[PDB]
Amino acid sequence: RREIKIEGDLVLGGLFPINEKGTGTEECGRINEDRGIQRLEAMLFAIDEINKDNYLLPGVKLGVHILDTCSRDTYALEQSLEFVRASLIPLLIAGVIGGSYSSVSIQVANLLRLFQIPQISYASTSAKLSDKSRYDYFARTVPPDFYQAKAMAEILRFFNWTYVSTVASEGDYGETGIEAFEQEARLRNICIATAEKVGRSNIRKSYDSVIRELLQKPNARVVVLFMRSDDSRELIAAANRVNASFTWVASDGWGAQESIVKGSEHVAYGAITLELASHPVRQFDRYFQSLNPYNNHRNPWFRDFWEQKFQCSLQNKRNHRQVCDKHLAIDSSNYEQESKIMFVVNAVYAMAHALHKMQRTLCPQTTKLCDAMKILDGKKLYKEYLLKIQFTAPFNPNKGADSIVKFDTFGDGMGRYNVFNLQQTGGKYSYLKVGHWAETLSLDVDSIHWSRNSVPTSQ
Amino acid sequence: RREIKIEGDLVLGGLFPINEKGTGTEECGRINEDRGIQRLEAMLFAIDEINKDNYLLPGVKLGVHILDTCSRDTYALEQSLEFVRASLIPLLIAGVIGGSYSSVSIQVANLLRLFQIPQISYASTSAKLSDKSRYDYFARTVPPDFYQAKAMAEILRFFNWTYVSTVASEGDYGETGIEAFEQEARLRNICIATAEKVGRSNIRKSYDSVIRELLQKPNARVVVLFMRSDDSRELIAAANRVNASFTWVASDGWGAQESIVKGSEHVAYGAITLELASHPVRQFDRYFQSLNPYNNHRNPWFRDFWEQKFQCSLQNKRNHRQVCDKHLAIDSSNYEQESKIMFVVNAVYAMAHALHKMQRTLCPQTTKLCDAMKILDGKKLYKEYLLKIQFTAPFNPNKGADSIVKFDTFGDGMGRYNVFNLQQTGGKYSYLKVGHWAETLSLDVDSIHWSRNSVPTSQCSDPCAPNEMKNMQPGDVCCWICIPCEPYEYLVDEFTCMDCGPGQWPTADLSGCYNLPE
Ligand SMILES: *[C@@H]1O[C@H](CO)[C@@H](O)[C@H](O)[C@H]1NC(C)=O
Ligand SMILES: N[C@@]1(C(=O)O)CN[C@@H](C(=O)O)C1
Ligand SMILES: N[C@@]1(C(=O)O)CN[C@@H](C(=O)O)C1
């Protein structure tokens, strides 16, 4: 049971899928490197920054209480109990920054509302959450799948892929996300071959089973994927053991993760995956790359991350091979900033700018946490929060790109996605940006390298 | 922070408004005597009984973990966190028996579902809870207000009280409960004069304010009340300071509590209040009356209850007057069993019979808690629970009165309500049962003692003058104007004044025309 406790004048809860969903009786598996450890640090970074900042919450140091969600909802839920219990050693939570998988953001939202705690997700995208009548204390800095589904169908409708198959992760994410695609699919005259869907505690046999059925309709060479990062790997893994080949069209769930195609660099070749529109946070880069087990002591998971990333081994381990070189480090050769890290940082600044207004509004005299705010008014903070608008943490170069954080009447973000193509040119697999989606598709077509190096056909 | 912990092979949570909602920064006010302390004890009693019982959960002693809800939702909610946390000193909760105010049963339900814990209320009545898509782990042994509102409207529709005023407690109980009456009200052609509603942290001024407004429509002498026990008292309190008088028609919220009219025995006289149909649990009577501070040590609130009920004082107190006689006791002169106590007991037995089945089903070999049930399957227990049917804890004499506990497809109970009349005959105020509601009203009318000892009247406009006038309707259906007619025209009907014509005249009563000579 590892957590992160940094005391402060005001505290923010944190939820990150630091560890993958553990198989069997256990709950937490291997370290999620890029979407777990990075995103986590990103929050620490953002806090660090908000504390070093003078024009945003100065007399109110921001403390954090971060918990791993081990990619499982029921688990994060239990963890989250930590925050509501913290309203009565206990940390007075102001807002929770969290919910990577939609699956857990919801399960968590269902509890924070009962205790009026503002939640902000930096990645959950299920349209289900937009419903501000069931998730009245939730907000996120990313747009719902209702706008990604469109982006997806409009990609097939452009390549006359009238007959394609769908397979979606079980769970509020994949489900709602596909039900979104299903609709947008019919409307553009696209018939769905076989409707596949994986699930929980699933092993190889259930994934191969899905591959089989994707093969029982060999007319549809284009398979649409609305699956979680994990279920999206197990699928490709299966599809590879039996040299099965298709034109993969996947939701951000797969996104541009090069860690999904690892071990099947080809069975996934010439695929098309979408991701959210984001511009890397310069400072975070230098920040993360500056980390190492000798200076990152506040992150209890760092060691395990270190040993796993470098194939290391140490005394604070079990019993393995190859000890680890001191001159080992995170550099530009072993690290690429995760796509959503931007959303993490904005999520936090939001919460902060939100509090920051409450500060100056409720307490004119000082810069410190007065008596007015000794005990926050959740409801208030949340309807003094949505109404937020600010220039993305200055960690952003431009300003003219609507790079300002704010929320809709639903508390969600702007639907800007990037279209990707999985290609390899020099013995190495990489993702190349080939168009995007603003409200209408776009892509330099003659940029795409397809499987069987030919523009596919699915009718 | 006081709780009750009795260890056991299986444990049941408990929520009771033992203390009234505290005013100011504090949270818990005075002890709720009859709906708090009694109902609490009734649960203990029921447990005590289920443990002394041989044919129902024998090898599985039932433990309880009871927490006061201080009548506040946000508070019970926090306390309830005690139970979900208890699924991981911590007590393995099987189900929570609780939720007096609807207000809190909901707020609570919202949390137990997140951890699959079966809840059962012995009194929350909000229709909102019937919705098994939002409260999938809730059940109760009382029927939704959807059936009480009907019973209420049907009581006014019988006394042609076409124009009456409504005032409802703020909070899921009063609100939803009135929205229920509002609808059933329109449907029976009943216009609502002024729609009043009290609230939170409300003091005298907001109650008087409500009285004032009830007075700004002095045509409606009948006021409908869908208010919590507490808000229902503050209102009458207010209504009394200013000798205001009406015919009070109140929901069970007020019910038949003689503790509501205390201090205004007359400003509330000749009122009509509804309650759930229930028959007192004989054994509980002997049981409760057998309690006293020297033998009730497991109930941490007992002393405070004792000191408060008897005006006592003790060393485990603050600093007051008049010490307390040892020979003080709860007898037939100072105690009347609360109306819902029955529901409390059934609520628990249900939970028990439920577990009891799970016991014999999951574990054929022994009578004890086996490995199959070491860790319960909420979802399962809940859909092995609703499907329950049993003869009310034998604490009931008859059997032929559908006195069997069970739940609807919604997890609610049977809508049977009793109609009451608040009357005083010998210097003492009491509640007299005067009819009930099965699915249709009923009441021996000539049983009711009204205020101004006269069957009241609540309509919009006065009746027309036969001698002349005709009924005229502008926009609504309760408010009309009386137009007199021309000495030469009769009335085809109540509303239409029709002219007789040439060489004729309308009869004296104005029902026809008598041919004139000359
Ligand atoms: C009003 O109530 C009286 C009860 O005495 C009844 O006789 C009368 O018919 C009612 N008015 C109508 C016609 O609705
Ligand atoms: N689209 C994701 C979700 O809403 O759950 C799937 N994976 C999440 C992530 O970025 O890690 C985002
Ligand atoms: N019907 C009540 C409720 O659910 O709120 C009103 N008063 C409660 C009580 O019995 O104390 C029950």
Tab-separated table of N, CA, C and O in Angstrom, chain A residues 35-101:
chain	number	residue	atom	x	y	z
A	35	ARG	N	1.937	6.078	-19.347
A	35	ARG	CA	0.683	6.687	-18.907
A	35	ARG	C	0.512	6.662	-17.392
A	35	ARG	O	-0.376	7.310	-16.849
A	36	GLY	N	1.367	5.911	-16.712
A	36	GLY	CA	1.290	5.839	-15.267
A	36	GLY	C	2.313	6.765	-14.643
A	36	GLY	O	1.989	7.874	-14.226
A	37	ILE	N	3.560	6.312	-14.601
A	37	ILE	CA	4.656	7.083	-14.025
A	37	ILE	C	4.833	8.511	-14.549
A	37	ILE	O	5.058	9.443	-13.770
A	38	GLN	N	4.745	8.694	-15.860
A	38	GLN	CA	4.906	10.031	-16.414
A	38	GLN	C	3.801	10.946	-15.930
A	38	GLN	O	4.056	11.926	-15.234
A	39	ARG	N	2.571	10.622	-16.305
A	39	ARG	CA	1.429	11.419	-15.900
A	39	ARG	C	1.484	11.752	-14.416
A	39	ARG	O	1.165	12.870	-14.020
A	40	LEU	N	1.886	10.784	-13.597
A	40	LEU	CA	1.987	11.015	-12.159
A	40	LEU	C	2.943	12.175	-11.959
A	40	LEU	O	2.574	13.233	-11.462
A	41	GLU	N	4.190	11.963	-12.346
A	41	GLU	CA	5.184	13.004	-12.205
A	41	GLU	C	4.642	14.325	-12.715
A	41	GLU	O	4.780	15.342	-12.053
A	42	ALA	N	4.007	14.306	-13.879
A	42	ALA	CA	3.473	15.532	-14.450
A	42	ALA	C	2.661	16.316	-13.439
A	42	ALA	O	2.676	17.547	-13.445
A	43	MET	N	1.943	15.615	-12.570
A	43	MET	CA	1.145	16.316	-11.576
A	43	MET	C	2.064	16.908	-10.535
A	43	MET	O	1.887	18.048	-10.122
A	44	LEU	N	3.043	16.124	-10.104
A	44	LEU	CA	3.999	16.597	-9.118
A	44	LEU	C	4.644	17.843	-9.703
A	44	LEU	O	4.728	18.879	-9.058
A	45	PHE	N	5.084	17.727	-10.947
A	45	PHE	CA	5.714	18.826	-11.656
A	45	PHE	C	4.847	20.065	-11.590
A	45	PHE	O	5.300	21.116	-11.135
A	46	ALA	N	3.604	19.933	-12.052
A	46	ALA	CA	2.649	21.043	-12.074
A	46	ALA	C	2.494	21.677	-10.693
A	46	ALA	O	2.458	22.901	-10.565
A	47	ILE	N	2.394	20.840	-9.662
A	47	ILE	CA	2.275	21.333	-8.295
A	47	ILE	C	3.534	22.146	-8.022
A	47	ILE	O	3.463	23.349	-7.757
A	48	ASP	N	4.684	21.472	-8.105
A	48	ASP	CA	5.990	22.093	-7.901
A	48	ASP	C	5.984	23.475	-8.509
A	48	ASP	O	6.369	24.446	-7.869
A	49	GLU	N	5.538	23.543	-9.757
A	49	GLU	CA	5.474	24.791	-10.495
A	49	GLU	C	4.521	25.806	-9.894
A	49	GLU	O	4.846	26.991	-9.781
A	50	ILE	N	3.341	25.348	-9.510
A	50	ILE	CA	2.359	26.247	-8.938
A	50	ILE	C	2.839	26.808	-7.603
A	50	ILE	O	2.403	27.876	-7.162
A	51	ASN	N	3.759	26.093	-6.970
A	51	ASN	CA	4.301	26.541	-5.698
A	51	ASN	C	5.459	27.518	-5.928
A	51	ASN	O	5.684	28.430	-5.133
A	52	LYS	N	6.191	27.325	-7.021
A	52	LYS	CA	7.311	28.201	-7.337
A	52	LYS	C	6.745	29.489	-7.939
A	52	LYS	O	7.421	30.515	-7.981
A	53	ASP	N	5.490	29.429	-8.380
A	53	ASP	CA	4.820	30.581	-8.980
A	53	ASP	C	4.382	31.611	-7.936
A	53	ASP	O	3.985	31.259	-6.819
A	54	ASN	N	4.450	32.884	-8.325
A	54	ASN	CA	4.091	34.005	-7.463
A	54	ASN	C	2.732	34.618	-7.768
A	54	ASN	O	2.090	35.150	-6.868
A	55	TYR	N	2.296	34.558	-9.026
A	55	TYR	CA	1.013	35.158	-9.417
A	55	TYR	C	-0.205	34.229	-9.411
A	55	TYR	O	-1.295	34.592	-9.883
A	56	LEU	N	-0.009	33.032	-8.869
A	56	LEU	CA	-1.066	32.036	-8.768
A	56	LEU	C	-0.893	31.273	-7.464
A	56	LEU	O	0.097	30.560	-7.278
A	57	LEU	N	-1.855	31.437	-6.559
A	57	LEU	CA	-1.816	30.767	-5.268
A	57	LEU	C	-0.408	30.808	-4.670
A	57	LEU	O	0.406	29.887	-4.842
A	58	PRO	N	-0.101	31.910	-3.977
A	58	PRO	CA	1.172	32.186	-3.314
A	58	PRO	C	1.175	31.827	-1.829
A	58	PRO	O	2.044	31.073	-1.365
A	59	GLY	N	0.206	32.379	-1.098
A	59	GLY	CA	0.098	32.126	0.328
A	59	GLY	C	-0.633	30.837	0.650
A	59	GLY	O	-0.988	30.578	1.803
A	60	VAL	N	-0.863	30.029	-0.380
A	60	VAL	CA	-1.547	28.753	-0.230
A	60	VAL	C	-0.756	27.646	-0.918
A	60	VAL	O	-0.978	27.355	-2.094
A	61	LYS	N	0.176	27.041	-0.191
A	61	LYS	CA	0.982	25.962	-0.746
A	61	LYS	C	0.058	24.802	-1.101
A	61	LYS	O	-0.832	24.460	-0.330
A	62	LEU	N	0.258	24.199	-2.267
A	62	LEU	CA	-0.581	23.080	-2.676
A	62	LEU	C	0.022	21.734	-2.348
A	62	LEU	O	1.076	21.370	-2.867
A	63	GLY	N	-0.658	21.000	-1.476
A	63	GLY	CA	-0.211	19.674	-1.104
A	63	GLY	C	-0.915	18.654	-1.980
A	63	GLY	O	-1.940	18.949	-2.604
A	64	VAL	N	-0.370	17.450	-2.055
A	64	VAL	CA	-1.008	16.439	-2.873
A	64	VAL	C	-1.072	15.116	-2.152
A	64	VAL	O	-0.255	14.831	-1.286
A	65	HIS	N	-2.065	14.320	-2.508
A	65	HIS	CA	-2.228	13.009	-1.940
A	65	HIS	C	-2.565	12.197	-3.161
A	65	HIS	O	-3.702	12.203	-3.636
A	66	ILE	N	-1.559	11.517	-3.686
A	66	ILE	CA	-1.741	10.727	-4.884
A	66	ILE	C	-1.828	9.237	-4.614
A	66	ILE	O	-1.079	8.711	-3.799
A	67	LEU	N	-2.749	8.561	-5.299
A	67	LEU	CA	-2.934	7.123	-5.126
A	67	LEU	C	-2.942	6.383	-6.467
A	67	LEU	O	-3.452	6.891	-7.464
A	68	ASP	N	-2.378	5.179	-6.482
A	68	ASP	CA	-2.338	4.368	-7.695
A	68	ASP	C	-3.702	3.728	-7.865
A	68	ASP	O	-4.318	3.329	-6.880
A	69	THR	N	-4.179	3.619	-9.101
A	69	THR	CA	-5.482	3.008	-9.334
A	69	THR	C	-5.357	1.623	-9.926
A	69	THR	O	-6.359	0.996	-10.226
A	70	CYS	N	-4.131	1.144	-10.089
A	70	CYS	CA	-3.888	-0.172	-10.660
A	70	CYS	C	-4.847	-0.507	-11.778
A	70	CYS	O	-5.352	-1.621	-11.862
A	71	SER	N	-5.100	0.480	-12.628
A	71	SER	CA	-5.976	0.333	-13.788
A	71	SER	C	-7.354	-0.276	-13.555
A	71	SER	O	-8.125	-0.431	-14.496
A	72	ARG	N	-7.680	-0.621	-12.319
A	72	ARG	CA	-8.978	-1.220	-12.062
A	72	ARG	C	-9.902	-0.226	-11.383
A	72	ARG	O	-9.486	0.498	-10.479
A	73	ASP	N	-11.154	-0.179	-11.822
A	73	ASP	CA	-12.117	0.737	-11.220
A	73	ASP	C	-12.374	0.401	-9.742
A	73	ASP	O	-12.112	1.217	-8.854
A	74	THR	N	-12.866	-0.804	-9.480
A	74	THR	CA	-13.154	-1.220	-8.118
A	74	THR	C	-12.017	-0.903	-7.168
A	74	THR	O	-12.243	-0.695	-5.979
A	75	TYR	N	-10.797	-0.865	-7.690
A	75	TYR	CA	-9.632	-0.589	-6.861
A	75	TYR	C	-9.470	0.897	-6.601
A	75	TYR	O	-9.301	1.325	-5.457
A	76	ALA	N	-9.513	1.686	-7.666
A	76	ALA	CA	-9.378	3.125	-7.516
A	76	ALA	C	-10.480	3.578	-6.577
A	76	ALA	O	-10.265	4.407	-5.697
A	77	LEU	N	-11.664	3.009	-6.769
A	77	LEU	CA	-12.821	3.336	-5.943
A	77	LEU	C	-12.462	3.189	-4.481
A	77	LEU	O	-12.628	4.113	-3.696
A	78	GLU	N	-11.975	2.012	-4.121
A	78	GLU	CA	-11.582	1.764	-2.752
A	78	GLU	C	-10.576	2.828	-2.322
A	78	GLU	O	-10.716	3.447	-1.262
A	79	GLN	N	-9.565	3.049	-3.158
A	79	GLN	CA	-8.536	4.041	-2.851
A	79	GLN	C	-9.191	5.392	-2.588
A	79	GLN	O	-8.976	6.005	-1.545
A	80	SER	N	-10.010	5.825	-3.543
A	80	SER	CA	-10.721	7.098	-3.486
A	80	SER	C	-11.433	7.294	-2.166
A	80	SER	O	-11.685	8.415	-1.739
A	81	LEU	N	-11.767	6.190	-1.521
A	81	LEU	CA	-12.439	6.266	-0.243
A	81	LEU	C	-11.523	7.071	0.666
A	81	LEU	O	-11.963	7.707	1.617
A	82	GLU	N	-10.241	7.045	0.341
A	82	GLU	CA	-9.242	7.774	1.092
A	82	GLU	C	-9.578	9.276	1.119
A	82	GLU	O	-9.435	9.943	2.148
A	83	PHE	N	-10.034	9.817	-0.001
A	83	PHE	CA	-10.338	11.240	-0.039
A	83	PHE	C	-11.613	11.680	0.671
A	83	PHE	O	-11.605	12.715	1.330
A	84	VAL	N	-12.711	10.935	0.534
A	84	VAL	CA	-13.955	11.341	1.194
A	84	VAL	C	-13.784	11.197	2.683
A	84	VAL	O	-14.344	11.968	3.451
A	85	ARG	N	-13.004	10.198	3.082
A	85	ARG	CA	-12.733	9.946	4.493
A	85	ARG	C	-11.860	11.091	4.993
A	85	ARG	O	-11.829	11.407	6.188
A	86	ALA	N	-11.169	11.722	4.050
A	86	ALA	CA	-10.266	12.826	4.341
A	86	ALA	C	-10.950	14.181	4.543
A	86	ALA	O	-10.273	15.204	4.678
A	87	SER	N	-12.280	14.199	4.559
A	87	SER	CA	-13.004	15.454	4.758
A	87	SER	C	-13.338	15.673	6.231
A	87	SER	O	-13.659	16.788	6.648
A	88	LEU	N	-13.246	14.606	7.018
A	88	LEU	CA	-13.542	14.676	8.445
A	88	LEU	C	-12.456	15.411	9.227
A	88	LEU	O	-12.702	16.474	9.801
A	89	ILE	N	-3.433	12.892	10.479
A	89	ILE	CA	-3.201	11.902	9.436
A	89	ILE	C	-4.109	12.126	8.221
A	89	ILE	O	-3.676	11.959	7.083
A	90	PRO	N	-5.380	12.508	8.444
A	90	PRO	CA	-6.284	12.739	7.311
A	90	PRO	C	-5.993	14.076	6.616
A	90	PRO	O	-5.730	15.085	7.279
A	91	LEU	N	-6.044	14.078	5.285
A	91	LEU	CA	-5.774	15.284	4.499
A	91	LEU	C	-7.005	15.974	3.899
A	91	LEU	O	-7.731	15.386	3.096
A	92	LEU	N	-7.220	17.231	4.281
A	92	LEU	CA	-8.348	17.997	3.769
A	92	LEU	C	-8.216	18.187	2.260
A	92	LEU	O	-7.491	19.083	1.798
A	93	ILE	N	-8.918	17.342	1.503
A	93	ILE	CA	-8.908	17.403	0.040
A	93	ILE	C	-9.748	18.549	-0.522
A	93	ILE	O	-10.883	18.773	-0.099
A	94	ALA	N	-9.192	19.267	-1.488
A	94	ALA	CA	-9.901	20.379	-2.095
A	94	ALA	C	-10.536	19.921	-3.396
A	94	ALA	O	-11.656	20.317	-3.722
A	95	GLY	N	-9.809	19.082	-4.129
A	95	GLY	CA	-10.296	18.572	-5.396
A	95	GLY	C	-9.456	17.390	-5.811
A	95	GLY	O	-8.299	17.285	-5.410
A	96	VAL	N	-10.031	16.489	-6.595
A	96	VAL	CA	-9.289	15.322	-7.040
A	96	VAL	C	-8.975	15.471	-8.499
A	96	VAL	O	-9.870	15.730	-9.307
A	97	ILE	N	-7.689	15.332	-8.813
A	97	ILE	CA	-7.190	15.398	-10.183
A	97	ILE	C	-7.046	13.935	-10.575
A	97	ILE	O	-6.136	13.254	-10.105
A	98	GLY	N	-7.942	13.426	-11.409
A	98	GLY	CA	-7.795	12.035	-11.746
A	98	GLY	C	-8.869	11.322	-12.517
A	98	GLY	O	-9.972	11.818	-12.777
A	99	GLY	N	-8.492	10.100	-12.864
A	99	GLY	CA	-9.334	9.226	-13.632
A	99	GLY	C	-8.721	9.108	-15.008
A	99	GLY	O	-9.004	9.927	-15.882
A	100	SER	N	-7.852	8.123	-15.209
A	100	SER	CA	-7.274	7.959	-16.528
A	100	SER	C	-8.314	7.220	-17.362
A	100	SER	O	-8.908	7.797	-18.275
A	101	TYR	N	-8.553	5.952	-17.041
A	101	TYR	CA	-9.567	5.190	-17.768
A	101	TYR	C	-10.964	5.718	-17.409
A	101	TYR	O	-11.254	5.982	-16.245
